[PDB]
Amino acid sequence: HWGYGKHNGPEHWHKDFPIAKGERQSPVDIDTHTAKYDPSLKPLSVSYDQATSLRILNNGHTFQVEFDDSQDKAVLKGGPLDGTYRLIQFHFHWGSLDGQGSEHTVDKKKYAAELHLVHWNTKYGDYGKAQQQPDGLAVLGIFLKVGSAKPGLQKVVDVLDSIKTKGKSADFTNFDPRGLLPESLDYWTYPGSLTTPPLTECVTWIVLKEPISVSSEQVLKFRKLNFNGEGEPEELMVDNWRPAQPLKNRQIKASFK
Numbered sequence: 001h002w003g004y005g006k007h008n009g010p011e012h013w014h015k016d017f018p019i020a021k022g023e024r025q026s027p028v029d030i031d032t033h034t035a036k037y038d039p040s041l042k043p044l045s046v047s048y049d050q051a052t053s054l055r056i057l058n059n060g061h062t063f064q065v066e067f068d069d070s071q072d073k074a075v076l077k078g079g080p081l082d083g084t085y086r087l088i089q090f091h092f093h094w095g096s097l098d099g100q101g102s103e104h105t106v107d108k109k110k111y112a113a114e115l116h117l118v119h120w121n122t123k124y125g126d127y128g129k130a131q132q133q134p135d136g137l138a139v140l141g142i143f144l145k146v147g148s149a150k151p152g153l154q155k156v157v158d159v160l161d162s163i164k165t166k167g168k169s170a171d172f173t174n175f176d177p178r179g180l181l182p183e184s185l186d187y188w189t190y191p192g193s194l195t196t197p198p199l200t201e202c203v204t205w206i207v208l209k210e211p212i213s214v215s216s217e218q219v220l221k222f223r224k225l226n227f228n229g230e231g232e233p234e235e236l237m238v239d240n241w242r243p244a245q246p247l248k249n250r251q252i253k254a255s256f257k
């Protein structure tokens with residue numbers, strides 16, 4: 001139904017998901033000059049040493065790497081968060097051209113892509129329950145710029161030909177998501193939403209200031225994927241990003257400056 005095309009893209013989503021026009025929708029433009037340094041924000045605690053990746057899946061919108069979230073193995077804590085958030089999956093958004101693709105923007109600048117590590121608050125017991133809560137999810141967002149290759153991304157890039165079309169999955173064990181992080185964990189944070197339907201307002205966003213570098217060849221492999229299923233007309237999976245939404249009555253906080 002929904003997608004990223006002219007006929008089913010972000011401008012249409014409000015008809016099936018009226019929260020699209022809500023008070024805390026994501027992504028947003030991060031105006032660096034209006035964000036508030038908050039000295040009381042804590043360093044982010046990213047504890048990914050025990051992470052158990054399981055599978056990679058083309059879901060028809062993006063691809064996602066999924067993790068075992070049935071124990072506290074890969075968790076996000078600290079920062080603006082109360083309590084412990086377990087990593088369930090990560091996915092990307094990217095463009096047809098290197099000058100677009102990110103969902104968040106920084107002083108209106110678009111990056112080539114954005115990585116989202118999705119976590120759910122363990123006080124709600126499972127991710128389905130967590131999505132129904134205003135503090136249910138925490139998504140760690142990381143910008144990708146085109147330059148030098150990111151060695152820790154290559155394992156992901158190399159399996160994409162085996163999940164070209166919607167509904168294809170592959171085993172994807174022993175992947176270390178620590179290899180996708182930049183040097184610094186300085187971040188902005190604000191309360192928002194899922195950026196795909198159902199657009200639920202259940203997300204604390206934590207967006208890292210420091211992008212990672214990926215090579216032009218790595219991002220060209222993302223653009224080889226297909227939105228369509230096997231045996232259907234080929235539609236390249238590109239421009240799977242929602243544009244910035246109105247900030248409304250929100251303040252973006254910075255952990256730095």
Ligand SMILES: NS(=O)(=O)c1c(F)c(F)c(S(=O)(=O)CCO)c(NC2CCCCCCC2)c1F
Nearest residue numbers: 061062064091116118127131139193194195196
């Ligand atoms: N940008 S985002 O982090 O809000 C987002 C997506 F863009 C997204 F595409 C997905 S997806 O890969 O699973 C595809 C469409 O759902 C999730 N995943 C979460 C949201 C969906 C419901 C379950 C809560 C945890 C997964 C998702 F959280």
Ligand SMILES: [Zn+2]
Nearest residue numbers: 091093116195
């Ligand atoms: Zn996302």
